[PDB]
């Protein structure tokens with residue numbers, strides 16, 4: 001078995017290997033990359049996403065989210081308070097202000113220490129989940145707006161044509177902006193490109209051990225767990241590496257820098273935080289290997305998780321027994 005310790009693997013494809021996206025994902029899996037739940041892909045030196053980032057300041061962040069924490073430093077939830085619209089140029093200035101800017105630090109490990117010590121005492125503002133793309137239309141390789149769609153994959157594998165669309169999302173971050181522990185909708189893959197700015201630190205649980213994280217989360221968030229049998233779908237719970245280690249949960253960590261891709265694999269729980277002002281682009285995708293994960297994915301039906309239009313067909317076709325209850329949660 002390749003990668004039996006489930007380590008995060010880093011890949012350096014050549015420009016020739018960067019042509020065929022599906023083929024490269026399958027290659028990474030042949031080497032055991034998926035066992036970690038997360039892989040890094042460093043693009044060939046010849047590649048670029050676009051020519052420059054000098055002209056992005058007028059993008060609008062219609063609903064910036066203030067991420068307010070509750071709990072203890074290593075075990076907390078966050079809720080999202082909606083703020084007034086602002087441009088990316090305005091958001092960048094805010095991220096760099098004295099109230100929000102990254103503190104002085106020695107290295108990524110010192111900054112990680114500071115994040116886990118102090119995150120709960122601040123409420124950073126995240127420009128998350130903005131439909132759009134920063135890839136140039138002429139970028140032919142690993143262009144996250146030009147990937148094969150999940151609807152087409154399901155149709156190719158299973159023969160059923162379905163409604164729905166699959167487009168990317170932009171994320172504008174600042175120091176301490178946080179992504180809570182989650183797997184993707186329908187335990188899909190994700191791919192994330194860090195276009196510009198400061199790093200993003202990731203934590204990940206191997207897919208084969210995801211239920212260990214779920215059991216800890218039920219223990220640590222006992223009211224939330226009574227409320228919903230899949231409450232991590234709400235994307236609000238944080239647990240620190242120190243707490244994971246104390247509870248024997250297998251995990252790994254890695255820091256993504258500008259110009260790098262990360263892929264999350266089906267049922268790979270992940271969480272993390274941004275180091276400072278940055279911009280990422282991410283999208284879900286599928287492969288043949290996903291279908292079995294999609295069929296088994298948990299679902300939130302309590303009403304909290306509320307998701308895209310396109311998840312309807314995935315549930316309807318892959319999980320017909322669950323469909324009626326899940327759809328009630330949507331309505």
Ligand SMILES: O=C(O)CNC(=O)C(=O)O
Nearest residue numbers: 171179190191192280282
């Ligand atoms: O970058 C973020 O805030 C969160 N991203 C992801 O969870 C992802 O790409 O799957």
Ligand SMILES: [Mg+2]
Nearest residue numbers: 056057058059
């Ligand atoms: Mg602009």
Ligand code: NI
Nearest residue numbers: 183184190270
């Ligand atoms: Ni994710």
Ligand SMILES: [Zn+2]
Nearest residue numbers: 228300302304
């Ligand atoms: Zn729920």
